[PDB]
Amino acid sequence: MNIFEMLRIDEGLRLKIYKDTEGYYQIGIGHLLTKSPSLNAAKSELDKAIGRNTNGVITKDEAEKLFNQDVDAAVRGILRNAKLKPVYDSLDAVRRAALINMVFQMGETGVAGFTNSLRMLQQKRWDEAAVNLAKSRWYNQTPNRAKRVITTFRTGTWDAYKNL
Ligand SMILES: [Cl-]
Ligand SMILES: [Cl-]
């Protein structure tokens, strides 16, 4: 199991534009297009992303290219983030994947706001950060996903993803 397999599971794969769980426009493997209400604005963003006239549709190959670019950017955002970096540097390989996952989903900014859980993660207080993480809008809006990530942080293994 790896970050790619992990997020593919959590985000799914869709070849047509679609609304995410907050009503935003996305496509591919969790690729956010626009926080705006226009399907047109989204088709515009999409073509610019793809570099061609899509018409709201991309190939698997295309979706995977956005995917690679997005995982890369998440990793680099964490590395450049003064609040995230040290957390990330203190964790083991599985747990780093769980941090990239949250970052991919909600942006560096959003994650950097989990100040208290970040502190516990840094201190290796597993079970307490797990409880802290659960007390969030994030866990309330997408609980199943939140639970897989959170278990990952708790146990340091891929258990929550095996089967899926
Ligand atoms: Cl992009
Ligand atoms: Cl969910």
Curated annotation (Swiss-Prot):
SUPFAM superfamilies for this protein: Lysozyme-like
Supply one GO CC term from the record. Answer: host cell cytoplasm
State the CDD domains in the record: T4-like_lys
What GO molecular function annotation could you give as one example from this UniProt entry? lysozyme activity
pH effect on activity, per entry: Optimum pH is 7.3.
**Record flagged with keyword Cell inner membrane:** no
Write out the GO biological process terms.
cell wall macromolecule catabolic process; defense response to bacterium; peptidoglycan catabolic process; viral release from host cell by cytolysis
The listed outcome for residue 117 to F is:
10-fold decrease in enzymatic activity
Q: Which Pfam families match?
A: Phage_lysozyme
What S-S linkages are listed for this chain? none
Q: What is the effect of changing residue 132 to M/F?
A: 2-fold decrease in enzymatic activity
| Catalysed conversion reaction | Hydrolysis of (1->4)-beta-linkages between N-acetylmuramic acid and N-acetyl-D-glucosamine residues in a peptidoglycan and between N-acetyl-D-glucosamine residues in chitodextrins
Is Oxidoreductase included in the keywords of this UniProt record?
Answer: no
Q: What does the annotation give as the result of altering residue 20 to A/N/S/T?
A: Complete loss of enzymatic activity
Record note on what altering residue 30 to A does: Almost complete loss of enzymatic activity
* Enzyme Commission number, as recorded: 3.2.1.17
Report keywords, A-Z: Antimicrobial, Bacteriolytic enzyme, Cytolysis, Glycosidase, Host cell lysis by virus, Host cytoplasm, Hydrolase, Viral release from host cell
* Residues involved in substrate binding: 32, 104, 117, 132
* Localization per Swiss-Prot or TrEMBL: Host cytoplasm
What is the uppermost EC class here? hydrolase
Please name the catalytic residues of this protein: 11, 20
Q: What is the effect of changing residue 11 to N?
A: Loss of 84% of enzymatic activity
* Induction text: Expressed late in the viral replication.
Family membership noted in the UniProt record? Belongs to the glycosyl hydrolase 24 family.
This chain's function reads: Endolysin with lysozyme activity that degrades host peptidoglycans and participates with the holin and spanin proteins in the sequential events which lead to the programmed host cell lysis releasing the mature viral particles. Once the holin has permeabilized the host cell membrane, the endolysin can reach the periplasm and break down the peptidoglycan layer.
Q: What is this protein called?
A: Endolysin
According to its UniProt entry, this protein's organism is Enterobacteria phage T4 (Bacteriophage T4)
